[PDB]
Amino acid sequence: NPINGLKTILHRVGFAMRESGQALERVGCRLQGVYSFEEKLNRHATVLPMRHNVPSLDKTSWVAPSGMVSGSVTLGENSSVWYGAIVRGDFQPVVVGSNSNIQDAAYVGATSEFSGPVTIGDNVSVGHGAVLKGCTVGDNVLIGMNSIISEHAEIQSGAVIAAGSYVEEGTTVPSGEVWAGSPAKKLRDVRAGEAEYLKSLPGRYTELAGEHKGIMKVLKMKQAEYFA
Amino acid sequence: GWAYSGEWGMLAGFCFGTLKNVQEGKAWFRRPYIHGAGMIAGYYLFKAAADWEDEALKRIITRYERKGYAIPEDRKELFAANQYK
Amino acid sequence: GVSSQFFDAPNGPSVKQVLIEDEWYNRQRSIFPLLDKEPYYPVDVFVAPNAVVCGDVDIYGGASVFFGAVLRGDLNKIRLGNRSAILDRAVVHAARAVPTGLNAATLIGEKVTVEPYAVLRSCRVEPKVIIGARSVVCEGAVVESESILAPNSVVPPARRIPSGELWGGSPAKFIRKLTDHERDRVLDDVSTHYHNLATMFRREALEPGTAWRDVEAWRQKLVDQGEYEWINFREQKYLMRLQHEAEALEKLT
Amino acid sequence: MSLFKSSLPAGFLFPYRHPKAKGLVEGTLYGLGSLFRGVGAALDELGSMVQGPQGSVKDHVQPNLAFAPVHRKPDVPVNAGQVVPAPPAAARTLKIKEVVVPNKHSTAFVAANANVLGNVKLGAGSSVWYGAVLRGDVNGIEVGANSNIQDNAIVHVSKYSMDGTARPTVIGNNVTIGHAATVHACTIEDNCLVGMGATVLDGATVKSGSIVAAGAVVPPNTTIPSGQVWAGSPAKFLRHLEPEEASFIGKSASCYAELSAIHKFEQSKTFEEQYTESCIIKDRAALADPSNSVHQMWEYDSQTALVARAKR
Amino acid sequence: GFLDKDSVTERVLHVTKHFEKIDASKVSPAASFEKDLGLDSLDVVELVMALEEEFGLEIPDAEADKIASVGDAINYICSNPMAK
Amino acid sequence: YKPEVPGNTVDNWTELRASWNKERASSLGTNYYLNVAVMGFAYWLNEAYYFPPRTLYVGALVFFALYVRKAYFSTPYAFKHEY
Amino acid sequence: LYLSTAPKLSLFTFWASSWHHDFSVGVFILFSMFIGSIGAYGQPALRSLFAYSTINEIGLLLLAVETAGFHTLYQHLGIYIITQLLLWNLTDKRLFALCAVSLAGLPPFAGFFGKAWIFWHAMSVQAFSLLAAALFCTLLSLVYYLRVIRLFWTAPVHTAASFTGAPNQTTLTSACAVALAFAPVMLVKPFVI
Amino acid sequence: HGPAQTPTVFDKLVEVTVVDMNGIRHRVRGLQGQSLAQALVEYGFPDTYFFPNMGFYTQHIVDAHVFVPKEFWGKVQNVDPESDDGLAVKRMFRDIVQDYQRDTSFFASYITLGAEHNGMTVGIGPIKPWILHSEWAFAGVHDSRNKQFDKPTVEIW
Numbered sequence A: 001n002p003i004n005g006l007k008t009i010l011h012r013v014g015f016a017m018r019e020s021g022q023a024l025e026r027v028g029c030r031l032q033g034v035y036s037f038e039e040k041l042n043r044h045a046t047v048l049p050m051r052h053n054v055p056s057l058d059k060t061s062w063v064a065p066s067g068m069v070s071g072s073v074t075l076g077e078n079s080s081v082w083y084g085a086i087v088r089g090d091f092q093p094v095v096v097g098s099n100s101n102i103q104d105a106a107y108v109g110a111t112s113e114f115s116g117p118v119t120i121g122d123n124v125s126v127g128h129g130a131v132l133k134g135c136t137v138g139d140n141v142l143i144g145m146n147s148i149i150s151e152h153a154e155i156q157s158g159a160v161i162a163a164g165s166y167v168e169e170g171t172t173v174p175s176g177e178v179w180a181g182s183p184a185k186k187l188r189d190v191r192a193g194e195a196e197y198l199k200s201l202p203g204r205y206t207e208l209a210g211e212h213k214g215i216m217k218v219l220k221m222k223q224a225e226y227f228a
Numbered sequence B: 001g002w003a004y005s006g007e008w009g010m011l012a013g014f015c016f017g018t019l020k021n022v023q024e025g026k027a028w029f030r031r032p033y034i035h036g037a038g039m040i041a042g043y044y045l046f047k048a049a050a051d052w053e054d055e056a057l058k059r060i061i062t063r064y065e066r067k068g069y070a071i072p073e074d075r076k077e078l079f080a081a082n083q084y085k
Numbered sequence C: 001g002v003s004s005q006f007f008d009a010p011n012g013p014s015v016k017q018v019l020i021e022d023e024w025y026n027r028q029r030s031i032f033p034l035l036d037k038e039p040y041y042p043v044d045v046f047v048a049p050n051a052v053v054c055g056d057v058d059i060y061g062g063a064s065v066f067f068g069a070v071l072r073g074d075l076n077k078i079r080l081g082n083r084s085a086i087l088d089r090a091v092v093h094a095a096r097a098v099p100t101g102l103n104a105a106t107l108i109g110e111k112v113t114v115e116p117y118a119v120l121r122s123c124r125v126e127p128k129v130i131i132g133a134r135s136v137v138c139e140g141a142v143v144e145s146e147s148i149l150a151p152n153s154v155v156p157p158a159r160r161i162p163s164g165e166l167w168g169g170s171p172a173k174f175i176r177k178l179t180d181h182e183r184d185r186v187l188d189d190v191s192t193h194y195h196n197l198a199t200m201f202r203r204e205a206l207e208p209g210t211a212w213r214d215v216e217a218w219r220q221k222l223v224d225q226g227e228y229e230w231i232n233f234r235e236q237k238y239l240m241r242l243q244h245e246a247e248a249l250e251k252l253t
Numbered sequence D: 001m002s003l004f005k006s007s008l009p010a011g012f013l014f015p016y017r018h019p020k021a022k023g024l025v026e027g028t029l030y031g032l033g034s035l036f037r038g039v040g041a042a043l044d045e046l047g048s049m050v051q052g053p054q055g056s057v058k059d060h061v062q063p064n065l066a067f068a069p070v071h072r073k074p075d076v077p078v079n080a081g082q083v084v085p086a087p088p089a090a091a092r093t094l095k096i097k098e099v100v101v102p103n104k105h106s107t108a109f110v111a112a113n114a115n116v117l118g119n120v121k122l123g124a125g126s127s128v129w130y131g132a133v134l135r136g137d138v139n140g141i142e143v144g145a146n147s148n149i150q151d152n153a154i155v156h157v158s159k160y161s162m163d164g165t166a167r168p169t170v171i172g173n174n175v176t177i178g179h180a181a182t183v184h185a186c187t188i189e190d191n192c193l194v195g196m197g198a199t200v201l202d203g204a205t206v207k208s209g210s211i212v213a214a215g216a217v218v219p220p221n222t223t224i225p226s227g228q229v230w231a232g233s234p235a236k237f238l239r240h241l242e243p244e245e246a247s248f249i250g251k252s253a254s255c256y257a258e259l260s261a262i263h264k265f266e267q268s269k270t271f272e273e274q275y276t277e278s279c280i281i282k283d284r285a286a287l288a289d290p291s292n293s294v295h296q297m298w299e300y301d302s303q304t305a306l307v308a309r310a311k312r
Numbered sequence E: 001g002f003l004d005k006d007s008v009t010e011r012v013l014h015v016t017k018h019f020e021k022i023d024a025s026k027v028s029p030a031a032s033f034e035k036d037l038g039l040d041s042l043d044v045v046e047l048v049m050a051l052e053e054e055f056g057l058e059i060p061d062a063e064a065d066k067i068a069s070v071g072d073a074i075n076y077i078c079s080n081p082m083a084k
Numbered sequence F: 001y002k003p004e005v006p007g008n009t010v011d012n013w014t015e016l017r018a019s020w021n022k023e024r025a026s027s028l029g030t031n032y033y034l035n036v037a038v039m040g041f042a043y044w045l046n047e048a049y050y051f052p053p054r055t056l057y058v059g060a061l062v063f064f065a066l067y068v069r070k071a072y073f074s075t076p077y078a079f080k081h082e083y
Numbered sequence G: 001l002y003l004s005t006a007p008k009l010s011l012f013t014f015w016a017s018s019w020h021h022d023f024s025v026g027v028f029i030l031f032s033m034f035i036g037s038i039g040a041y042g043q044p045a046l047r048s049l050f051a052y053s054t055i056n057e058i059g060l061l062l063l064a065v066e067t068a069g070f071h072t073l074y075q076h077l078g079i080y081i082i083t084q085l086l087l088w089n090l091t092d093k094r095l096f097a098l099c100a101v102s103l104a105g106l107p108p109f110a111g112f113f114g115k116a117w118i119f120w121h122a123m124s125v126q127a128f129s130l131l132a133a134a135l136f137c138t139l140l141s142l143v144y145y146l147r148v149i150r151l152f153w154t155a156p157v158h159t160a161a162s163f164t165g166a167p168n169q170t171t172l173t174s175a176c177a178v179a180l181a182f183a184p185v186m187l188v189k190p191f192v193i
Numbered sequence H: 001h002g003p004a005q006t007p008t009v010f011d012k013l014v015e016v017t018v019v020d021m022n023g024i025r026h027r028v029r030g031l032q033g034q035s036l037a038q039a040l041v042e043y044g045f046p047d048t049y050f051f052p053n054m055g056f057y058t059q060h061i062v063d064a065h066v067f068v069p070k071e072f073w074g075k076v077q078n079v080d081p082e083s084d085d086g087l088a089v090k091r092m093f094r095d096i097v098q099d100y101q102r103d104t105s106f107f108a109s110y111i112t113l114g115a116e117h118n119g120m121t122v123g124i125g126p127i128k129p130w131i132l133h134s135e136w137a138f139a140g141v142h143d144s145r146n147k148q149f150d151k152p153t154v155e156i157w
């Protein structure tokens, strides 16, 4: 891809100009006698591009400040990445649908050498502390807390993965079924009263993401009062 | 002296900067101002070496002719020349 | 209760202690010492900005600490081998003692990869080992060389995984033997792949970056208003030590 | 009062920021520095423009989420955190009158990169460690005195559940919550231990003096009685408590009190103190040479690297 | 096993022989200092000091307090890595 | 497959220990005697550079054949109590 | 580092400037070359390896002195001094292999050129026996320079970072002296005369 | 394969009693396949007890002078005295031990711990002053509290 070749040349030239400028600014600081540049503050980035691969975030999506997205990440409409969650697409890309939630300190990524891209559908609940490596998740699926979904596994639409389960590599989970266990296996079908709570789950997270985004805006304005 | 000594000095400066990065654990393109300073120093160092080439040839022919070794005029141009070979 | 002031710290007592609720920006260091226990690391290490490496930790060669991972060497020593990868938000801790009577330090050999959300505490991991995701290896346990632990596995305290095999489950049982090509090449392949990803991150990092400009702008505004306090920290540490010695002497007699 | 308390130059006393320039030479250097800073920031911005869309992402300091507010809800009662008045900028911009911040005791330790939000109460001598998530947003989170939530552990509550019950999370006294443990809408009584990597689900009760083992999954609405150890996925009965493990629980709580003290001491130092300490470390390593020419005249203080007295 | 179990035994008997309060024929290769030979603590300390003089060692107070028999003394000398 | 070490472990380790139960001398005596030998008697070789090459080559081979190696050197005289 | 560079330059310049003798130094050439090569082959400590290899190099410089032709002496001494400046200031151990290939006289690097003009001028005035001994000791020297390469090139890389400032403080000089792979273009010409 | 025992660390544990040069007995635990010098280092013994293995390509291995009883003489690994490893052991005996040598003198890296060493009692032997380079030497007196285990690297240079 020669387009990527031109982008590579431009990114490397701009990076060299940035290094030269920051170094000259540090020389200026040393001449002034001010050593604020030496502070070992937290250099965490909520959005982390990988050369010319920038995450594509919708204007109604939200990523928490302790969360992060890296590389080729697509977040759809009203989709949320919560506190401490890590979504990594610097090796292979990540695609997240609309109204889907990646809950607190969850890992979604495609970083193994033979992993395909991660594809998460619409209205998907990814629970606390779940690890997702190179999988495909269909629409209206709850990923339970502290669960592992392996490479090339297919979580079809309407299925429930229980908490603490481990779905093996290349495992197809059918529609409308509940699977549990560390050698994860079919337990039962999804019941109707269960499916009502499954339908009502992602909208709550949408409104919770709205409230938390507003509070983070308040925090940013409080921070901006100090230096501006 | 040699015609392409400055270009050789610039390649030497680039390799110098790359090695100074590799020793300190950085990628090859990091700190390009170090590469630029190394290129300037390498260019002027190898141009000075190429000047010493002509100077050494001139000293040899001058000393040899003062001692009594008479060199024919077809061969004196091999020495008393700022040849840009 | 334990006081939060230390007069026998190597660099002296803390003159000014800041409450955490009074902080207006995040000041979490990624590499920092705990009294006299300083981390040791090479020139080509990758430490992620939201990872924490504290205390008595030795890092070698081409090892990497990925995003949100914790290596806390406060009760004992932790060693990370050459080209060993600690992936995203895995925890490595160490106890003061183990039931087996051996050294309680967590020792991780070269070419060892530790998958996301795994926990290692006072265990011995020999070279070329894959620890799976959501796995716990407890106090005093031993994982032998060229072995693989399946994801979501528990290794109970003072237990052993034999060399050359794949183990998994809670508690961990025998699954299968690794092939000879798996022991020869695949473990090194996984470690090399994660080192390459860490190198990709290391190439693009601008350290220290430019986030300090705002904090310096706030400090410049304070110097403009005349509210910036200049503290002689060396002299205050000296005077606090002298007062501590006088207070200690004026109670024994 | 070291030995030269009235003759040291201001640059040596204040290495983080030198005082105001006086003479012609210092002012010329300051002006050159401001020019260099301007040209350097300009070249940085131009390089970010030439670079492409990746240059639009800028380096910014992160908010302090160790002490963070949530929305005060009318249906949610505030029993763990405290309702504090909103900032006036937030009120005049995006319609906030009251927020909920945590109730944090003065002896508790919170990691600078932890996330403690909203309706959370932290008891005396308790600790929340690096990367822990305590999100009290739809209900309350209570942590007792001398309790520790270890690294990368997740604590969360429910308001809406499958069976329509709003459940807080209550953690008793002298409780150890293991590394990467998941605590979700449940009750942990006094002097209990939850193993590292374990999961306790909604509405489960761990009675006093019990242990949940490492990697265990506690199913919802399960009661683990006193003096029992449970393990597995799903967790069943394994053993009764040993005589020594009950004292081991208290030993673990006391050990994390002692550890949280040292970590709070290191964490709560200012930038100026840290920079002064780095200059002191540099001087100490320069003084470690026994052939240093000052060793024959001056004796140096060990902790600050100042001249204490004349040796001869 | 740092030294043999015969020559050390006869050397032990040789230094046990010159004690005025002991019987030169009652001494056996496996006896006791208290029930058999009839010695209090100070006599035991004196015998251990004689053994230390013959083998060129240093036996601390706790180790010499644990020694209560001829066989115990022989085993302690044999287990010692600095014996002569 | 790995080859077997020849011999017995006790006998081999006694062979490894032999003739080293002795305090090593300082090197000052060897160095001073070498410098005295060169500074006093190396002028005896001044006319040797003009001698025929067969003589010089045979003399070099003779010096190589009668040379005793300094490393791992031992004498039986180190452990006897009379000549 | 100080002892292997500066006094040898000072004393050889005095020898070039104001010294004549009516004698020979050939037996000391033989002693230095054979003793240095065999000693560096036999000594496992690295400090003794480099001491004996230095004795071998001073034997080569004495062969350059004995056959006259001080131009080859000065060229080899300069290349040796630059290698010494690289050797004693190394923190990355991979460049220890460049010192090894450039002290073994391997062709494209500058040590080859420094040895090879000494060999050329020795063959020009027909100093055959000393030259043959020098060639045998050059064949022996390669074995322990290969031992150096085995030790420090075919090994995993570990270089500790600085903690108390001064971060890898002599990378400039060591990286500048490693560019003895670019000096051979000027060395092949009639340069040092 | 059946209901047989899960592997424990206690199955591979080897216990050795070590008497240091002050006469104090120590309990040293190790694992099968680990050398004795490694178990001595990990126990926490001071750095003055250890010295480089003086062979080519093995100076990064630390070694100690131990006294081994006659019952365990045949469980030390065999070294050919004509090989290069034999000359390494001869150099170590020539330079480090000298006149502290006894008939029970061995070197701890040549002892590989197995079940046959379980209950074996060894003692640490004295050594003479030595130097490898400026950053690794021994002046002759065992007055230092620095453990060998706390050194991050073993440096041949």
Ligand SMILES: C/C=C/C(=O)SCCNC(=O)CCNC(=O)[C@@H](O)C(C)(C)COP(=O)(O)OP(=O)(O)OC[C@H]1O[C@@H](n2cnc3c(N)ncnc32)[C@H](O)[C@@H]1OP(=O)(O)O
Pocket: C093, C121, C138, C139, C154, C155, C156, C157, C158, C170, C171, D150, D176, D177, D178, D179, D193, D194, D195, D196, D211, D212, D213, D214, D215, D216, D229, D231, D232, D238, D239, D252, H006
């Ligand atoms: C950083 C702070 C640390 C702390 O202070 S505590 C937090 C972390 N601590 C922990 O690791 C808690 C868990 N540790 C323990 O293992 C313990 O508490 C666990 C106590 C119940 C038991 O650990 P033990 O070392 O006492 O092992 P047991 O003798 O009780 O094992 C009996 C049995 O249970 C099984 N067992 C034992 N432990 C576990 C586990 N963990 N999971 C599943 N199954 C297990 C095991 O299979 C055993 O059977 P077999 O191996 O088949 O013979």
Ligand SMILES: CCCCCCCCCCCC(=O)SCCNC(=O)CCNC(=O)[C@H](O)C(C)(C)COP(=O)(O)O
Pocket: E039, E040, E041, E042
């Ligand atoms: C240079 C010469 C200077 C010497 C000066 C030093 C002289 C110090 C002498 C004074 C110290 C004493 O008597 S100390 C007083 C010793 N008497 C007591 O303590 C009362 C209890 N009786 C015992 O202890 C007996 O020894 C016994 C019943 C045998 C216990 O049997 P064992 O033994 O089995 O235990």
